[PDB]
């Protein structure tokens, strides 16, 4: 008898490495264990953190007794406008001229995917999307599933645990004209290594000269440094130089709306007419993917952005979150010197965001797990969110022991 | 030059165009029979009381907003499978299924289509009913499949072309994909009767077709969730390992929360595990993980006995409102003196009705009475209320007499 089914030939997918680390962490019986693979912000008690401004926004919304009817294909208009304003800045000529289209998406991933699908259909010049080495794990399958091809450019420098400026500029200067270049706006995931403003300026010059299309992923505006204007400076600089970028925004981190799935995709265009045509085709792409986006998170974000008192309170809360992460970076470096480490750990404080490439080797990572129950990925990436005032001393001691 | 000089403006949306034209009309007696969502008897959006209670239950728990798994909220997925398959389903007992949370029904359709594209080595063809939901074609086309058609609606009876459907399905190449609306066919409202479903199942099984069910109206269609899901359950009983796209947009009124689920019925639990792994691999690069608000609500309703009972009552009232408007339209048409057969209006199921009105009659209804509907004669029964059903019947009588 032929006992075949439809899916006999469907193989079991490979294990997710990051998930494996957190799963291993959960099983560990050591009371001193640390999870430096956690992929979301945690407070100084190591707990999930709902922003008070978000709670207050929820109360504002709940009192209005709103319906749950479908949003437009491109989402909540109020949210889209406010999202664009956050990214581009109040003084933006792009906003004043209306030479842009912003559509609400299923968080940052949704924005990346919609952007990729738009490129597949309309960016006829090339299929190649250049990603930094390394980049977010999901970037490759997003573009690949969308029907694009992936290339790489040097970014992280293993020798310094910093930015390979020379290597990056060299690689970008050799990217075929009219190719897509993906850039992390700030808080590079997973290294935390960001170009300095003067380095950004040089990159922009090459992008403009070689007629590259700049695709910005901005998942950490405000969360990175505590200053939303500073964090979005590179994006705004490119636009000022006449580079009509696209932009993927997430509110997962900076508003802690992880599971609500709140994001936006923006295309900066030549003029309002071009934006209208791009908008129509974006909607044509969105509708057969999920028809229209979720309401709850967009209402919360819109309420925060468009209510002055809430916006101010939110920006305060974001700064405190950014400062906690900066503080843990600073305390780790300080404690490492206290422990008597002679290794250069300046990269830990030079990096930005909740992900840090430590430079730890796989063998050292393995020892940290076995001996100290400190869990991180084999690449030596740590989630700074997993570090608190209570365990930063323990972490520094452990890192010293495995590197001394 | 610019990057997007060659990007052209998209074509006008016919459905939206009807609503837009309706909005502009200055006639105080105007009716929008193109509305694509439930409305109460006052023509207003309707949030279910059970949903409000669920929200209150959830708000009190002070829950976080952390990422769900790729496949969504586990308790929602399990409850959703149970709703579709029935509590005593052998599929549940054997565990030979995978259910993942999706971005409502559209999300489920697209995930299903993407799964077919990647793993359904047996065919590229997806057979849609004539007619079907407008979004079906682009979902499968964008996903990388080919579309075909089978006869479904009979314009001569405004009913189900059983003979034509069975004929067409019997000639579908073996191991093709067949899309079926579980109940409340959109846009016609014409459904196979149980006995007709049985013969369709026999042909599907004989021709070794893959049955892809779209179920957006369980409970909403007839007020009886078990009746509405009967065809899906029958196919499974007959050894057809279907997939299923569920939406909670209509039956819980969770439209904009985007609450849905995709279920694959599998040979065994092992197969389900492999399919699950690949579903997650497809989901993650689309949107990473699904929204938590609506799933928590649906889960709370389904898993709280009191809320579930109240919800099912509310669903019945909504279904009965639509049935009531169909009945009253036909009755009023009779009283107006119409000699035409309007039995199809009460035979059809769901909030969409193919009236059989010709394009010329549709135009007159717009011009003379400001009653707005699509040129195919489809009306949204949700646009009909106690206050306007008399006006509608008079108008239809005038244009058809
Ligand atoms: Cl344990």
Curated annotation (Swiss-Prot), chain A:
Q: How does activity depend on pH?
A: Optimum pH is 8.5.
First-listed, main subcellular location of the protein, grouped into a coarse class? mitochondrion
Q: Which residues carry this modification: Phosphothreonine?
A: 22, 307
Write down the InterPro entries for this protein, in alphabetical order.
Aminotransferase_I/II_large (IPR004839), Asp_trans (IPR000796), NHTrfase_class1_PyrdxlP-BS (IPR004838), PyrdxlP-dep_Trfase (IPR015424), PyrdxlP-dep_Trfase_major (IPR015421), PyrdxlP-dep_Trfase_small (IPR015422)
Q: Which reaction does it catalyse?
A: L-aspartate + 2-oxoglutarate = oxaloacetate + L-glutamate; L-kynurenine + 2-oxoglutarate = kynurenate + L-glutamate + H2O
Transport as a keyword of this entry, yes or no, is yes
An example of a Pfam family matching this protein is Aminotran_1_2
Modified positions (N6-(pyridoxal phosphate)lysine) in chain numbering: 253
A biological process (GO) of this protein is: malate-aspartate shuttle
What cofactor(s) does the depicted protein rely on? pyridoxal 5'-phosphate
> Single GO molecular-function term?
L-aspartate:2-oxoglutarate aminotransferase activity
Q: Which residues carry this modification: Phosphotyrosine?
A: 70
Q: Where in the cell is it found?
A: Mitochondrion matrix; Cell membrane
Residues with the modification 3'-nitrotyrosine, per the entry, are 70
Instruction: State the family named in the UniProt similarity comment for this chain.
Output: Belongs to the class-I pyridoxal-phosphate-dependent aminotransferase family.
What is this protein for, i.e. what is its function? Answer: Catalyzes the irreversible transamination of the L-tryptophan metabolite L-kynurenine to form kynurenic acid (KA). As a member of the malate-aspartate shuttle, it has a key role in the intracellular NAD(H) redox balance. Is important for metabolite exchange between mitochondria and cytosol, and for amino acid metabolism. Facilitates cellular uptake of long-chain free fatty acids.
**What subunit structure does UniProt give?**
Homodimer.
Q: Which PANTHER family match?
A: ASPARTATE AMINOTRANSFERASE (PTHR11879), ASPARTATE AMINOTRANSFERASE, MITOCHONDRIAL (PTHR11879:SF39)
Official protein name in the record: Aspartate aminotransferase, mitochondrial
Species of origin reads Homo sapiens
Its gene name is GOT2
